[PDB]
Amino acid sequence: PKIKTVRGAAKRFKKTGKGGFKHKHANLRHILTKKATKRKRHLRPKAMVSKGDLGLVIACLPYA
Amino acid sequence: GIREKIKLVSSAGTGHFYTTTKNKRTKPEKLELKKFDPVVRQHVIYKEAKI
C-alpha cells in the first residue's frame, strides 16, 4: 500500500529550495543562566542538515 | 551549589530582566546595577527579585 510518513520527523525538518532540510538547534530549552550570551546568540537561527545525515532523513520523509 | 539564582528586574517598566546567582548568607544586601535595557535602548537601574 502507500508508504507511511514518520509523523515525528515531519515536526522537525522542512525542505528548502534545492532539496536540503533545515532544523532547529539544540541546547536552547533549559539551563540558560550558566550559558554565555555569545553561545546562546549563535543557537537562535536555523541550520542545514549535514551530508552524513541526509540519507537517514530522506528515508523518514518519503512525501516531503 | 549553595549559591542560588535570582533575577534583576528593570525599573523602566518594560518587563525585561537579567539572571545571575548569589549567596544569601554572607551578602543580604539587595543587588543594584546599571545595565542596558534593549526595549527602551537606555542604561537604567535594575533591582533584585525572585526567579
Binding site: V6, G8, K11, R12, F13, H23, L28, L56, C60 | -
Partner: protein, 96 residues
C-alpha cells in the same frame, strides 16, 4: 531511523512552528496564466472556470512571472508592485 541504540537524529532535535489553515485557501497567479481567461476580466470566478486555481481557494495574488501582452482588467485580487508596472505597460488596469 534505527542506529543501534544511540538516540536518533529525529528525536534529539526540537520541534517548532504551527500549521496555518489560511494558507490552504490562498493561491498565486502568474502573468502568463493571465491571458487564458474568457472575456479579458481577470476575476476569482473567471480563474476557476479556466482551471487556474482550485475551487476551495478564496484569496489570490498576481506575481511577476512570465509575460503579459493583451490588455486585461484585474478586479478584486492582490498585485505586487512588479506585476502592477507590467500590467499597466500593456494597457490594462487594476481596480480593487
Amino acid at each position: 531511523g534505527f542506529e543501534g541504540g544511540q538516540m536518533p537524529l529525529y528525536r534529539r532535535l526540537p520541534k517548532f512552528g504551527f500549521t496555518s489553515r489560511k494558507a490552504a485557501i490562498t493561491a498565486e497567479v502568474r502573468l502568463s496564466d493571465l491571458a487564458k481567461v474568457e472575456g479579458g476580466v481577470v476575476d476569482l470566478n473567471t480563474l476557476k472556470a479556466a482551471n487556474i486555481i482550485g475551487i476551495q481557494i478564496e484569496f489570490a495574488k498576481v506575481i511577476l512571472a512570465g509575460e503579459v501582452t493583451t490588455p486585461v482588467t484585474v478586479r478584486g485580487l492582490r498585485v505586487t508592485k512588479g506585476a502592477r508596472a507590467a500590467i499597466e505597460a500593456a494597457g490594462g488596469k487594476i481596480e480593487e
